Amino acid sequence: MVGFGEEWRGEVVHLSWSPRAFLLKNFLSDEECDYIVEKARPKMVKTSTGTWFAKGEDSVISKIEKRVAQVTMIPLENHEGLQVLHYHEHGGQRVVTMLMYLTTVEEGGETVLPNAEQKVTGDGWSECAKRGLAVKPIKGDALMFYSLKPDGSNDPASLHGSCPTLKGDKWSATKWIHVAPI
Ligand SMILES: [Cl-]
Structure with a gap:
């Protein structure tokens, strides 16, 4: 497993500069999640x-x-x-x-980043989620974020956790990637 291996093409949403974060819509097919x-x-x-x-x-x-x-x-x-x-x-x-969501969660279960510069507000966000920047689990979506600043220093804004699920069943897959070859 070296290098880069027909490419993927979907919607990208920029979420934050602190931590630097993007949502990748339909990054996994439903078939791949299952x-x-x-x-x-x-x-x-x-x-x-x-x-x-x-x-x-x-x-x-x-x-x-x-x-x-x-x-x-x-x-x-x-x-x-x-x-x-x-x-x-x-x-x-x-x-x-x-972080890849393998299932859609109807209520709660958000990934939350409590030290992000943004907090979510209003309709459709659980109380836990409202503590920081949050993302709803939708089957196939992926949340990508950087844990270091460009200069290689720590970005404390990248701390994350899972909110309790209130309605639904949460499965996730997480990939970590390093600055150098393992
Ligand atoms: Cl999570």
Whole structure:
């Protein structure tokens, strides 16, 4: 799994400069989300359950991993494997997080960034979500953000957590990528 591997094409929404963050709409197909859930399901171990796929371990996931390299412009040598969660030498510093929603969550369950410069307000945001910048889980969407400033210093605005789900069932996959080859 090196370099960059027909490209992905969807909608990009800029969310913030602190942390620098983008929403990628329909980054995963519905078919890809359902695959990842079912492939992960029998591996899930204990809140949330989870499992880990090594970079390049799975053929369908590997296609997606290439897509992440392409959109981030960072070669696959720098990437970790894939963490899947269900809610109920090393490459140097981590620089970018990609969080992919495998299911749509009707109410609550937002990713929240409480130290972001923005807070969400009003209709359709849970009370937890209103503590910072938040993103609704929609199947196929991906939240991309940088944990370092351009000069390589820490961006504390990139701290994130999961709001409790009030209506629905939240599955997510998280890809971390480093400044250098692992
Ligand atoms: Cl989350």
